[PDB]
Design a protein around this nucleic acid. Structure first.
Ligand SMILES: [Zn+2]
Ligand SMILES: [Zn+2]
Lengths: 67, 115, 154, 45, 259
RNA sequence: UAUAUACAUAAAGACCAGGC
């Protein structure tokens, strides 16, 4: 749904790197250069940001129960 | 619904003794220690400190089952050296190692910062 | 408040010997069938334990001198049968002392205040004299805790 | 007595037992139960 | 028949990272050190969460999940706090726990991100780590949604639940160029060389050393941001020596009681 | 003071989907 805090394998924090990672893609970085600027060396962390699927933007289209 | 509590691994409830010492009838000077609520962190240190002691013929541990947390340590020493003495000297020798390592790691830090 | 034993069957009614020793007439539907306590125990006039099926002698009260089999027991009353008694199909009623042998916590929301579970909120499924069963709101499980540990919340 | 939330205009209305279900200011027939007052306490586990 | 005397050389020291090299030690002692870097280094992390009003698209215990995993600055007062189970007082006091508060409502039409910067602590010492670099994201809100909750953070360690691991991945390596033959390569020439390798590009492996035993245990210890990486290590040694000083005690009481 | 609140009800059948 929303990007995990704490990469599953190692336990580093990828929670805060998502909104910084979308910025780099719109600056015409390649996912290899984006993930290196964010400073994620191991491929356990590089698969959190790379394979992530953000549904919290879809789910915010529907209107809440309460106005 | 049957998942055991997370704390059940390192916490002792009422009546459980930490250590249980039972002599071993197969062998002279053989003793068998039973440590509740421990795992390979603690068991492996001691075994490997017992095998430095030249008066220790045998030392080894096992976790009987991984889902219940206890260690079982057999020790066999040479005559006129008690297997309870072997296991105490092991623990005091680690404490005298790890207290030397914590002091040598603090010196290398101060050296490392601005030096 | 009143129990009785059916002693005559009629087309629309029963004759019932009530616990006071009077026979009343009631419509079949005006009385409800009561669950008999075959394991009831009482004290006789000499403090013996008496039970259903026991043979007792009556030593005081209206039926003094009679002998009977205990058929039913309720509070201070015993319904007895003696086949020699033609009245009421053999049934009669005597005080047991005239004979001689011949929870609030459940539902509350409690907070575990001590021990390894300290802090968990739950609701009591079952209460005991000793260890209540708290239903944990945090996880899916039910645990037994000494009632000294629990603390009721609101 | 009982406060329900309209599924269309999202206006809490107070409607009670033995009443047809229609929210005022819409006419929409689907009501929701709001949320309980009592304490919920979770582990961060 | 006595303990060996090890030595330490700190190579890299930063705010995320420590590389040290421990020499003259057993394989079993050097391991049990890094095996304490995960479990038994205490840390502060949210445990008891109370959710007053949650209108977010994420259900209650899904947010109570993400809050736990948020690292909190444990730098000092972890020594001062007592485990909540050992603490005598009813419920939570200042001594066994820290209180956090999050009251967030989205008024604007724009989508609001609730960030760990919105956790507000009763004490200045422990805060979310990013507040000491973008902030951890707890949840997003559409206009009209409101999330307010109260959470008490406790002291614990990494055996209980993985949210108390003080560390990110803890590297461990010994004998980088393979003398001891603990691992046997079918073709030695296809394997890349360790950062720590002493070998020229020409030869694949060190030659077999019959007498040797593993020494020079290379670590890399990378913090999560709770504890500065220098004091993840000091707390592991001081925390292993306290478990071995709990044995010598309760063993001595048994040998004296049994005999 | 004594005594008491003791358990039963959710039918059955049909087709459909899946598991080993
Ligand atoms: Zn990772
Ligand atoms: Zn409406």
């Amino acid at each position: 749904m929303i990007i995990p805090v704490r990469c599953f394998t190692c336990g580093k924090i990828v929670g805060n790197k998502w909104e910084a990672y979308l910025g780099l893609l719109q600056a015409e970085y390649t996912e290899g250069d984006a993930l290196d600027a964010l400073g994620l060396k191991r491929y356990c962390c590089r698969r959190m940001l790379l394979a992530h699927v953000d549904l919290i933007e879809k789910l915010l289209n529907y209107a809440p129960l309460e106005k | 619904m049957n998942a055991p509590p997370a704390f059940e691994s390192f916490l002792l409830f009422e009546g459980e003794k930490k250590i249980t010492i039972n002599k071993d009838t197969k062998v002279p000077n053989a003793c068998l220690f039973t440590i509740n609520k421990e795992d390979h962190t603690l068991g492996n240190i001691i075994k490997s400190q017992l095998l430095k002691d030249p008066q220790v013929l045998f030392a080894g541990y096992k976790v009987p089952h991984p889902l219940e947390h206890k260690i079982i340590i057999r020790v066999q020493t040479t005559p006129d050296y008690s297997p309870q003495e072997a296991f105490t000297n092991a623990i005091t020798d680690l404490i005298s190692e790890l207290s030397l390592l914590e002091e040598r790691f603090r010196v290398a830090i101060k050296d490392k910062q601005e030096g | 408040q009143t129990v009785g034993v059916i002693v005559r069957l009629e087309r629309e009614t029963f004759q019932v010997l009530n616990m006071y020793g009077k026979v009343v007439t009631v419509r079949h539907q005006a009385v409800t069938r009561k669950k008999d306590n075959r394991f009831a125990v009482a004290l006789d006039s000499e403090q013996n334990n008496i039970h259903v099926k026991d043979i007792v002698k009556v030593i005081d009260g209206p039926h003094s001198g009679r002998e009977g089999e205990i058929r039913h027991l309720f509070r201070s009353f015993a319904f007895l049968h003696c086949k020699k008694l033609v009245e009421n199909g053999g049934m009669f009623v005597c005080k047991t002392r005239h004979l001689v042998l011949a929870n609030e916590l459940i539902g509350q929301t409690v907070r575990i205040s001590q021990g390894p579970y300290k802090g968990y909120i739950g609701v009591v499924k079952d209460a005991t004299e000793s260890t209540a069963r708290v239903e944990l709101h945090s996880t899916c499980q039910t645990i037994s805790v000494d009632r000294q540990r629990l603390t009721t919340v609101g | 007595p009982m406060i329900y939330i309209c599924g269309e205009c999202h206006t809490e209305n107070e409607i009670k037992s033995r009443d047809p279900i229609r929210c005022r200011e819409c006419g929409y027939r689907i009501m929701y139960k709001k949320r309980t007052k009592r304490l919920v306490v979770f582990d961060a586990r | 028949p006595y303990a060996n005397q090890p030595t330490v050389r700190i190579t890299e020291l930063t705010d995320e990272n420590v590389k040290f090299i421990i020499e003259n030690t057993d394989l079993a002692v050097a391991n049990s050190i890094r095996r304490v870097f995960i479990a038994e280094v205490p840390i502060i992390a949210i445990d008891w969460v109370q959710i007053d009003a949650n209108s977010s698209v994420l259900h209650d215990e899904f947010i109570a999940h993400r809050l736990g995993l948020i690292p909190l600055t444990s730098d000092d007062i972890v020594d001062k706090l007592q485990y909540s189970r050992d603490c005598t007082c009813e419920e939570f006091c200042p001594e066994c726990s820290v209180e956090f508060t999050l009251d967030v409502r989205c008024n604007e039409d724009q989508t609001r991100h609730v960030t760990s910067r919105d956790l507000i602590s009763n004490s200045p010492r422990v805060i979310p780590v990013t507040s000491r670099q973008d902030d951890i994201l707890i949840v997003k809100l559409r206009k009209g949604q409101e999330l307010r909750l109260r959470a008490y953070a406790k002291k614990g360690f990494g055996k209980e639940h993985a949210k108390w691991n003080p560390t990110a991945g803890v590297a461990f390596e010994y004998d980088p160029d393979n003398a001891l033959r603990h691992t046997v390569y079918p073709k030695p020439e296809e394997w890349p060389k360790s950062e720590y390798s002493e070998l020229d590009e020409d030869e694949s492996q060190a030659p077999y050393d019959p007498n040797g035993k593993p020494e020079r245990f290379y670590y890399n210890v990378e913090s999560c941001g709770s504890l500065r990486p220098e004091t993840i290590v000091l707390s592991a040694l001081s925390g292993l020596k306290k478990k071995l000083s709990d044995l010598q005690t309760q063993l001595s009481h048994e040998i004296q009681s049994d005999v």
